[PDB]
Amino acid sequence: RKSVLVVRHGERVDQIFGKAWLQQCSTPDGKYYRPDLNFPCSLPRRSRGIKDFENDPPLSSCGIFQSRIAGDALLDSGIRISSVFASPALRCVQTAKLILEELKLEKKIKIRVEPGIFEWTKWEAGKTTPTLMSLEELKEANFNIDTDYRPAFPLSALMPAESYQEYMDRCTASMVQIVNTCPQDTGVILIVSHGSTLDSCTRPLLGLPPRECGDFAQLVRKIPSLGMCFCEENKEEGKWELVNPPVKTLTHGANAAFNWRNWI
Template identity: 65%
Template sequence: QTLRALFQYKPQNIDELMINAGDLIYVNPAQQSDASEGWVIGTSHRTKSEKEPNVKLNGEAHNLSMSRSATNALSLQNAALRRAVLVMRHGERVDQVFGRSWLQQCLTADGKYYRADLNFPSSLPRQKDGMKQFECDPPLSCCGIFQSRLIGEALLDQEVTVSYVYSSPALRCVQTAQHVLQGLKLNPKVRIRVEPGLFEWTKWEASRAIPNFMTTAELLEASYNIDTSYRAHFPLSSLVPTESYEDYVSRSSAVIKQITSACPSKAPLPPFFAFPGVPGVILIVAHSSSLASLTRPLAGLPSRDSRDFAQMVRKIPSLGMCFCEEQKEENKWQMVNPPVKTLTHGANTAFDWRNTILGD
């Protein structure tokens, strides 16, 4: 049986093997009686030639002659129960760049939308209550779309298997989820589960009223790939404006527990392997506060003090990520490095050629 590694694994003992994502590992079922509990013995097909220490094997490399491959005794931590949760913040939102009055900047005298700067999206989706609603539920900027797509492509490069996608009902989160799935080439295979319980702390984002989010029908009409069979744990009607910090913390803690228990944890094969039946990553696209409020209860950490919380949340960039892996013991989770790197880029400022170039 030949398996393909899903994640990198760094050896922690001399009888363990360095595994890169994409490595092909031969596992002989007859040999497994020698393996200690939770481990398997296998052989890596990866060449060990000094010249190509980082070579990654794919389907074709499988046909390399065995003389170029090295054979290594291999122990793999058997996490047949291992799951992972990737929590990410949405991409750049238009009001982050153009301020609260962004929509006014984009309306013609007769109320039509136009693109006042090339970072505004080329069009807005239809909303039953009119464009005005987008002031409380702003879309991604073009830069936000670029960021989301890039992260999706990077996850694909790392051969991360995403099996479930949950999103806050905020338009920017649904859009981010959609563009990440496009980058992953999983659109429309994996559908987005819109979970109102993932919305931002309402004290920050809904001080007077919960925004009129786009309905499932509207999202579908705008070509968003929504899972219509999904039943939310927290219906929209359960969200209240200006909730207390304690209420937000307990809502977040409840929703992450409900999400993880709704995604199957039993699987028949060893860890690291992208095979049907192996639980893939549960992707959750939500808000900057979600990176702490969803992962800390999962990892068994206490919630942050409400004052520290605001300060911490300000440091989280677009597409900032936290990654939790389930441990050998079921429902024990640990925060580890996300499967892809950070995304760091500069700002691009407004430019007035008349003042700058023509002026004397």
């Protein structure tokens, strides 16, 4: 039974360590270090050193954990993943890769990067698209990217401070392209993206117009890291329906910092 599984990326470092996270993990000469264990072990190599990560931040160590444990659960559920699409955000592509590794499909399935499902530009740093990693850079960072895939949109088409309606229209238009890419295929089309994507990419499949922005927003507030929305196609009736996701929720506590000097 053909289906689409939309998945929110794992915890992003700047969610915890704030908008200036990069300044906390950078030396004067622009080199990386971990001031806290939730900063990732390393950062992949990128053109202008590590400058361009500032608004395209990686997963935290926790976000890696979340991604891995969800992927492990997807393996155990037994469902078949036929393809994987991803927002060009590094956090989303990183989440895609970690899931594929746990499924043992990292070498068999390439990631199709689709700038058309990038986050609503109203919710980004400068109310605009940041510098993202090139596909050449992702290959060099050992991501198995599908360079033959012709995406619905280039990143440059994404308007800064686009309206709610414009954001929904480009996600809808992207979901036309996504479904038509290998249409015979049954199996799960995995889409690893942002919170908003759970609604923006499933609505058009269900034959529904966008929600009122308010209701959309309230619904997105509640999507946790690696939250999922699952839609199955009923082939006979030519119709899609929302379904219980193939894995359970993931619920855990925070962990605060401590200052050892307090003991003195």
